[PDB]
Amino acid sequence: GNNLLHVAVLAFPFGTHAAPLLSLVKKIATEAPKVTFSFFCTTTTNDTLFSRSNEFLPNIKYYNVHDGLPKGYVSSGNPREPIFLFIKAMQENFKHVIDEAVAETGKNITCLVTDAFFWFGADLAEEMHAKWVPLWTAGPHSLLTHVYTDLIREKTGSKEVHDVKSIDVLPGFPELKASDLPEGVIKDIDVPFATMLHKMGLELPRANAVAINSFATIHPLIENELNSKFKLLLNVGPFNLTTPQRKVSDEHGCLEWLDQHENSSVVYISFGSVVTPPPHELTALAESLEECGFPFIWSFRGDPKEKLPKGFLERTKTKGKIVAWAPQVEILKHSSVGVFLTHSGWNSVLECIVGGVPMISRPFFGDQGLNTILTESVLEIGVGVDNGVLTKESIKKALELTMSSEKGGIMRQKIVKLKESAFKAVEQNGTSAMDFTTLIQIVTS
Numbered sequence: 214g215n216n217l218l219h220v221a222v223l224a225f226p227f228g229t230h231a232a233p234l235l236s237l238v239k240k241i242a243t244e245a246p247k248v249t250f251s252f253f254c255t256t257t258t259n260d261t262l263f264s265r266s267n268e269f270l271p272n273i274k275y276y277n278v279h280d281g282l283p284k285g286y287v288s289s290g291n292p293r294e295p296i297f298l299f300i301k302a303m304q305e306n307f308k309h310v311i312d313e314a315v316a317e318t319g320k321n322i323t324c325l326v327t328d329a330f331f332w333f334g335a336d337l338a339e340e341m342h343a344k345w346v347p348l349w350t351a352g353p354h355s356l357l358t359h360v361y362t363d364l365i366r367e368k369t370g371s372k373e374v375h376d377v378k379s380i381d382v383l384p385g386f387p388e389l390k391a392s393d394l395p396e397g398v399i400k401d402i403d404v405p406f407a408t409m410l411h412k413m414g415l416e417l418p419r420a421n422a423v424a425i426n427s428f429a430t431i432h433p434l435i436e437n438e439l440n441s442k443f444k445l446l447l448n449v450g451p452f453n454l455t456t457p458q459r460k461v462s463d464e465h466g467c468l469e470w471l472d473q474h475e476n477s478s479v480v481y482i483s484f485g486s487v488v489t490p491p492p493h494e495l496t497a498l499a500e501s502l503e504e505c506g507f508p509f510i511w512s513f514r515g516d517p518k519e520k521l522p523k524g525f526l527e528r529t530k531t532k533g534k535i536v537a538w539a540p541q542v543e544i545l546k547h548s549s550v551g552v553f554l555t556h557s558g559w560n561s562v563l564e565c566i567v568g569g570v571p572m573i574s575r576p577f578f579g580d581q582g583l584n585t586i587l588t589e590s591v592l593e594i595g596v597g598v599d600n601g602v603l604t605k606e607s608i609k610k611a612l613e614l615t616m617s618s619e620k621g622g623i624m625r626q627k628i629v630k631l632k633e634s635a636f637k638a639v640e641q642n643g644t645s646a647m648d649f650t651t652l653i654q655i656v657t658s
């Protein structure tokens with residue numbers, strides 16, 4: 214593109230949303246050095262994202278957007294409170310800062326790239342006579358679930374709303390219970406997050422193009438519907454293969470430690486950038502761990518003994534590891550690791566498909582439920598813990614099953630062939646490289 218183009222990038226501050234988006238942006242900015250990229254997110258998220266050294270692509274500048282929290286505000290109860298406050302004032306807070314970036318660069322916005330959550334991107338793009346390109350950072354099946362929100366509700370009564378009778382929502386997908394769906398589709402339909410997702414489903418067809426961090430082999434039938442709902446659908450993932458972003462950090466020699474172990478023998482544990490199993494769960498896992506023998510790596514959450522038992526800490530310090538932050542993508546590509554105990558967030562899922570490792574899923578929130586059903590029943594590269602909770606009986610059951618002598622192997626096989634499609638999809642010749650090239654064209658023109 215030319216030196217007159219200005220791309221505004223609006224990222225979601227919570228969960229693993231902002232980093233994947235920034236990654237996509239970095240790939241584009243490298244290909245288009247004369248194009249200006251303005252990245253908007255909360256001060257706290259920007260601080261974490263832009264602390265990186267020479268990662269300073271010159272044509273990318275970040276701008277802090279108000280987090281919606283009132284003056285003096287203090288934690289309070291539920292961790293949902295700051296998310297709800299952000300959502301409630303995000304449109305005007307984004308606009309205020311976008312306005313500063315336009316006055317400062319002297320360049321009107323030509324393209325608005327946003328997390329798909331930002332349904333208001335169409336309206337904003339409209340006002341500035343700019344293009345709108347939202348990015349759904351999760352899977353195709355959940356995106357389509359949101360596009361189908363009204364349809365689902367219209368075919369949902371007292372039975373289904375209460376898990377008595379299952380709903381047939383997605384093509385080429387098992388029948389689901391309301392508890393399977395992301396909060397908001399059929400429950401708590403009124404809260405800000407739920408309203409944000411519904412509006413997104415309704416506004417997406419107005420976009421110039423809808424990008425998604427996924428690849429065409431993930432779900433053919435779902436993709437076809439999405440393809441018919443939007444002006445353009447672009448599969449630009451998996452991001453771990455299509456975009457840069459370093460992070461090859463092993464402050465705790467996990468990979469070396471992994472070297473000094475054999476194949477499919479280590480248990481990697483990670484429940485995302487925000488989750489930490491409840492008390493009865495952690496304690497059920499920690500013990501499940503040092504009773505199964507299985508060597509392991511566990512990404513806790515900074516806090517060590519804080520939640521974990523003292524003794525346990527220095528008793529397993531010989532057959533397993535526990536870190537605050539691990540080099541997950543690399544760990545998942547290591548031949549040592551045999552199973553991935555995850556909450557099935559989408560990013561971790563794409564990373565596991567690329568690494569070729571079987572999965573143990575204990576979903577918590579959002580799309581994790583649909584993701585578990587997708588990898589357990591449709592891709593068959595994983596299984597979920599019993600009851601969706603972590604109890605010593607449910608854990609061992611899963612470990613034993615995946616680390617078994619049959620099922621675990623097959624899953625590993627199924628995910629190796631999927632891994633193959635992933636690598637193929639990103640060759641210049643594949644659909645992901647091609648949709649990415651198109652994305653670049655739209656964003657930089």
Ligand SMILES: O=c1ccn([C@@H]2O[C@H](COP(=O)(O)OP(=O)(O)O)[C@@H](O)[C@H]2O)c(=O)[nH]1
Binds near residue numbers: 229560561
């Ligand atoms: O020790 C860790 C734990 C997590 N992650 C990364 O954190 C992200 C988790 O995203 P996901 O969508 O799986 O779950 P979320 O954070 O949205 O709940 C993934 O990129 C993981 O690789 C990591 O790099 N090291």
